[PDB]
């Protein structure tokens, strides 16, 4: 069981080109994954002063590659109201509500599930303070480094992609995951 939450920045200062290509790279992400015989329920975001969600996990056909595909080629870079700010611990945030219990309790094979938060941003944060506490909190949700035995860090990967010429690598590197052996911060022109 996985989840893949698909988060790409649509502020100004990513820009209309490197966001098609942006979108472009997750598209064939989705295609890479399914050609591996997977069906991951997908969540996709997009944001900027605030965030947009364009598909939640638990939505019927999150796990139809055909039709995430589909819904993520009809955004548009305009289709994003105040892009003057980005508000990266906001769009976090955004997945974490996703991630969130419907009946206060873990749901019925709760700690099987992978999360894979896939983010694309050129790390210039400028609203909503340091994003990583967001990253912290879903840890606390899944219960992943609480058990000294069973840390768990298996279930949470957090990839990010650094996107345009303009980034601030000190804050790209500080969201994504720090794996032995594994790499986790790419560029566009760069899985799940
Ligand atoms: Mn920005």
Redesign the pocket.
Same mark, same amino acid.
């Given at each position: 069981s996985m989840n893949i939450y698909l988060v790409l #920045?649509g502020?100004?200062?990513?820009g209309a080109s490197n966001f098609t290509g942006a979108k472009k790279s997750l598209v064939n992400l989705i295609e890479k994954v399914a050609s591996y015989g997977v069906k991951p329920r997908y969540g996709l975001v997009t944001y900027?002063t605030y965030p947009k969600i364009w598909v939640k996990v638990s939505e019927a056909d999150s796990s139809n590659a055909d039709w995430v595909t589909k819904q993520l080629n009809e955004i548009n870079y305009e289709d994003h109201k105040l892009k003057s700010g980005?508000n990266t611990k906001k769009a976090l945030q955004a997945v974490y509500s996703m991630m969130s219990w419907p009946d206060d309790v873990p749901p019925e094979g709760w700690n099987r599930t992978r999360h894979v938060i896939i983010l694309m941003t #050129?790390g210039?944060?400028?609203m909503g303070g340091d994003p990583i506490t967001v990253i912290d909190e879903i840890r606390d949700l899944l219960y992943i480094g609480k058990d000294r035995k069973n840390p768990r860090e298996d279930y949470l990967d957090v990839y990010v992609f650094g996107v345009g010429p303009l980034v601030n690598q000190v804050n790209i590197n500080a969201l994504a995951s720090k794996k032995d052996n594994e790499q986790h911060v790419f560029k566009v022109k760069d899985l799940s």
């Amino acid at each position: 069981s996985m989840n893949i939450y698909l988060v790409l #920045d649509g502020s100004d200062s990513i820009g209309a080109s490197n966001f098609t290509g942006a979108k472009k790279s997750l598209v064939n992400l989705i295609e890479k994954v399914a050609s591996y015989g997977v069906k991951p329920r997908y969540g996709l975001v997009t944001y900027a002063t605030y965030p947009k969600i364009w598909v939640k996990v638990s939505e019927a056909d999150s796990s139809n590659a055909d039709w995430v595909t589909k819904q993520l080629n009809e955004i548009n870079y305009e289709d994003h109201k105040l892009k003057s700010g980005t508000n990266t611990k906001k769009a976090l945030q955004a997945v974490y509500s996703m991630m969130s219990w419907p009946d206060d309790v873990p749901p019925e094979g709760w700690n099987r599930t992978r999360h894979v938060i896939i983010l694309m941003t #050129d790390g210039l944060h400028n609203m909503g303070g340091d994003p990583i506490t967001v990253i912290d909190e879903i840890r606390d949700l899944l219960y992943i480094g609480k058990d000294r035995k069973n840390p768990r860090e298996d279930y949470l990967d957090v990839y990010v992609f650094g996107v345009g010429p303009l980034v601030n690598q000190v804050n790209i590197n500080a969201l994504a995951s720090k794996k032995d052996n594994e790499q986790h911060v790419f560029k566009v022109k760069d899985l799940s």
